[PDB]
Amino acid sequence: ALPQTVRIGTDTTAAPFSSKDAKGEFIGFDIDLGNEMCKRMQVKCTWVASDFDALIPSLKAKKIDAIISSLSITDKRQQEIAFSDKLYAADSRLIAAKGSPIQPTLESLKGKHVGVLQGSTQEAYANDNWRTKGVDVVAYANQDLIYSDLTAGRLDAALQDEVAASEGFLKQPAGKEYAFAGPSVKDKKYFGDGTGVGLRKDDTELKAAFDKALTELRQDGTYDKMAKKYFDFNVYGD
Numbered sequence: 551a552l553p554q555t556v557r558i559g560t561d562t563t564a565a566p567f568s569s570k571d572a573k574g575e576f577i578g579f580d581i582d583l584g585n586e587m588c589k590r591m592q593v594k595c596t597w598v599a600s601d602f603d604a605l606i607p608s609l610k611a612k613k614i615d616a617i618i619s620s621l622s623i624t625d626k627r628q629q630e631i632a633f634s635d636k637l638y639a640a641d642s643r644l645i646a647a648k649g650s651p652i653q654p655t656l657e658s659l660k661g662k663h664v665g666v667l668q669g670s671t672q673e674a675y676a677n678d679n680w681r682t683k684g685v686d687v688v689a690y691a692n693q694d695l696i697y698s699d700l701t702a703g704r705l706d707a708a709l710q711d712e713v714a715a716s717e718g719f720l721k722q723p724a725g726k727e728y729a730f731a732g733p734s735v736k737d738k739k740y741f742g743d744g745t746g747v748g749l750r751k752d753d754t755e756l757k758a759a760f761d762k763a764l765t766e767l768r769q770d771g772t773y774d775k776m777a778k779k780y781f782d783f784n785v786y787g788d
């Protein structure tokens with residue numbers, strides 16, 4: 551009763567999890583996971599690019615069937631949609647210029663310009679904790695714009711997923727003179743517990759198939775094989 555084609559929405563400004571190569575094709579760990587799960591599910595899968603903040607609306611409107619886009623499993627989102635089991639762990643952390651004294655605190659940030667991705671958990675955290683209290687929190691339609699405004703000095707800092715920032719910006723030439731500003735920001739309520747496949751709540755059979763495939767590809771070591779392409783550490787977490 552699975553669809554012949556599972557349509558999977560993703561935002562492509564999140565290397566090494568999801569982005570586009572020079573041909574415009576989807577690449578990254580999210581794509582590898584999604585493709586491998588679909589293979590084991592014996593379904594065709596079609597990737598659909600969209601802005602991050604359009605993913606959950608598109609899912610609810612049935613324009614896509616699933617979201618694989620470093621989508622954090624939060625209490626708040628679970629009131630709207632369902633999730634597969636955890637795909638990998640994710641933390642949030644600030645980045646700023648190398649040498650910056652910036653810390654993820656109100657005192658340190660009050661007066662600064664801080665970029666966040668529209669529709670993200672980081673946007674939610676920053677709006678409640680920082681924007682109300684004077685911090686210029688600027689929301690962006692995609693993370694590419696954020697990095698651009700940061701390196702152009704239009705932003706002083708940016709709050710986003712730690713691993714994506716590290717592997718996709720900081721460890722790349724463009725992020726050479728940038729670094730994490732302070733430790734990971736810990737807030738269980740806002741940031742949730744790793745990422746998962748976002749699904750409509752009533753698609754019970756689809757969720758069971760993703761979950762089965764995920765457990766199996768983890769059990770036979772395929773997960774770790776695919777992960778080693780991008781990461782030299784345990785990206786799954788606990």
Ligand SMILES: NC(=[NH2+])NCCC[C@H](N)C(=O)O
Nearest residue numbers: 561564619620621622670671
């Ligand atoms: N493909 C992306 N740009 N993903 C951003 C994910 C940010 C965060 N994990 C969230 O779920 O809100």
